[PDB]
Task: inverse folding
């Protein structure tokens, strides 16, 4: 069917991201989809803040490790096994088809 | 007839749930339930459609018991003398041959039995298919 | 679905289908009585299943045994008598019937 | 900025194949036709993809023991950046010791776990007896 299922992955963790991308390409291969490159784009800094009871007159800086996976042969097994196997929290999965 | 049910099991998507053998067994069940309507006599009609060789051949069970109510299926515990039956229990006859496997109610009860058995089989399959993962995080 | 005038009726017994012919119309002479079946018609009853896995079944294996309903013309209750003539107007394109 | 930014784009294709197990030709075709990457010079992309030669696995075998983090738990991004940081003078030696080291550490500074370049530079001590043109 139509091709470009492009997955962005914001993240603040490291090992679970490797695990997630690995099992994602694993599922793509268990389907047969022409999985494109995960292509780890350059890490993006983020000055965070602490919106709780502050200090007296800290999650302030963090490094978002990003992932760009792509599935361009979505037969039944891709979406089936993907919606079946959930992914841990702490990562953002804003996907696109277009 | 037989060719029709073969075309069914060919078009049957869940061929693993019901290959030709159990397909035709369920169809013999459906044919017995149809003969239940063809005759006001409530007789167990095994057919043995000859799954792949040829067409069907209706039979008539004897339901071995000392009773005679509904005599189409009544034989005592030793009545096996003629026909060289020589069987006390299980001895069932083939007196009536070539009932209808093509009319309206035949095909309607065929549809009903097919959908019922297919849904039951897929349910029983998925039950164990997911029971495999007993002890894992599943959605829902 | 279209309307057919087949001889078979899904529910009624043998008596209610004894007067008709092989096509599904009474012979010319059957002394019918209020309640009997002149024709002989069935209708597509059901709707909204939307399971093509069963539509493929009942398109070849149940092609004409899917949505039956006996909206058949019965003689009104009370009027008896003898059938003496049967006219059949068939729309062109619609093929034919044996009695026609 | 044409041969410099070359490596920080081919590490992508390297990691991509490493996760995909496809052919390097496949991943390079898809990376090029994926985004028009001009930060890499085409021939230096060819050289970096030639940086999948068997000797690359060999530079994994040499620096194996003196790794402050074990092999079978290292991050794939770290695997790729390590292969490149050792291959910079396995055969190519386009720039001397300090230049290529700083190249690997900085042009791949935005891919690690906030500290990985520290320990890859620290393992580069084991890279000394093979990076001879100091």
Result:
């Amino acid at each position: 069917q139509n091709q470009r299922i492009r997955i962005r992955l914001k993240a603040f963790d490291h090992r679970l991201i490797d695990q997630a991308t690995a099992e994602i390409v694993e599922t793509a291969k268990r389907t047969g989809a022409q999985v494109r490159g995960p292509i780890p784009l350059p890490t993006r800094k983020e000055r965070f803040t602490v919106l709780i009871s502050p200090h007296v007159n800290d999650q302030y800086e963090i490094r978002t490790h990003l992932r760009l996976v792509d599935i361009v042969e979505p037969t039944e097994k891709t979406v089936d096994a993907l919606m079946r196997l959930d992914l841990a929290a702490g990562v953002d999965v804003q996907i696109s088809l277009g | 007839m037989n060719k029709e049910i073969l075309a069914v099991v060919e078009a049957v998507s869940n061929e693993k749930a019901l290959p030709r053998e159990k397909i035709f067994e369920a169809l013999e069940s459906a044919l017995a339930t149809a003969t239940k309507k063809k005759y006001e006599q409530e007789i167990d009609v095994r057919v043995q459609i000859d799954r792949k060789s040829g067409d069907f051949d209706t039979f008539r069970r004897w339901l071995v018991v000392d009773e005679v109510t509904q005599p189409t299926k009544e034989i005592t515990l030793e009545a096996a003398r003629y026909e060289d039956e020589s069987l006390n229990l299980g001895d069932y006859v083939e007196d009536q041959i070539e009932s209808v496997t093509f009319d309206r109610i035949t095909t309607q009860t065929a549809k009903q039995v097919i959908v019922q058995k297919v849904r039951e089989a897929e349910r029983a399959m998925v039950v164990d298919q997911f029971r495999e993962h007993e002890g894992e995080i599943i959605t829902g | 679905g279209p309307e057919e005038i087949t001889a078979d009726i899904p529910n009624v017994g043998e008596a209610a289908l004894s007067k008709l012919d092989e096509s599904g119309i009474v012979y010319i002479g059957a002394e019918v009585t209020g309640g009997d079946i002149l024709v002989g018609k069935v209708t597509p009853k059901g709707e909204t299943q939307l399971t093509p896995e069963e539509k493929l079944l009942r398109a070849i294996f149940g092609e004409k045994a899917s949505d039956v309903k006996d909206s058949s013309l019965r003689v009104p209750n009370g009027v008896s008598g003898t059938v003496i003539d049967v006219q059949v107007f068939t729309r062109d394109g619609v093929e034919k019937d044996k009695r026609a | 900025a044409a041969r410099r930014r070359a490596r920080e784009c081919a590490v992508q294709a390297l990691y991509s194949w490493q996760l995909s197990q496809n052919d390097i030709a496949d991943v390079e075709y898809q990376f090029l036709a994926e985004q028009d990457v001009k930060d890499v010079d085409v021939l230096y992309f060819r050289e970096l993809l030639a940086g999948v030669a068997t000797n690359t696995a060999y530079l994994d075998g040499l620096m194996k023991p003196y790794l402050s983090r074990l092999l079978e738990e290292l991050g794939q991004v770290e695997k790729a950046v390590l292969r490149i940081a050792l291959y910079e003078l396995s055969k190519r030696s386009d720039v001397p010791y300090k230049v290529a080291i700083n190249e690997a550490i900085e042009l791949a500074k935005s891919f690690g776990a906030e500290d990985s370049h520290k320990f890859v530079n620290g393992v580069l001590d084991k890279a000394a007896p093979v990076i001879r043109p100091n």
Summary: Residues 15 and 80 of chain D are 6 Å apart (CA to CA). Chain D has seven helices and no strands.
